Amino acid sequence: MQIFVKTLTGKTITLEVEPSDTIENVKAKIQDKEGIPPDQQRLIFAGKQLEDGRTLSDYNIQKESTLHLVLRLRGG
Known part of the structure; x- marks a missing residue:
């Protein structure tokens, strides 16, 4: 499946993932x-x-x- 990640600079990261992937799987892909x-x-x-x-x-x-x-x- 295709999902959409919006960053603070406004970049649209488009990721093929599957629903049984982890949020650490997401972090590694990005x-x-x-x-x-x-x-x-x-x-x-x-x-x-x-x-x-x-x-x-x-x-x-x-x-x-x-x-x-x-x-x-850094501080948080």
Whole structure:
């Protein structure tokens, strides 16, 4: 399935994934494309901060969903 990731600079990252992929699978795929390490990524679906070992299915994430990408800071 195709999902859509929106970054703070407004970049649209388009990812083929499958619903049983993890949010750490997501973080690795985006690094492959944009050079961002998973450690600095925080990922938000519908106001909710997403946790790494959980699956896209478990969050109710399916095709054509908008997900949002945040950079974690130094102090936080």
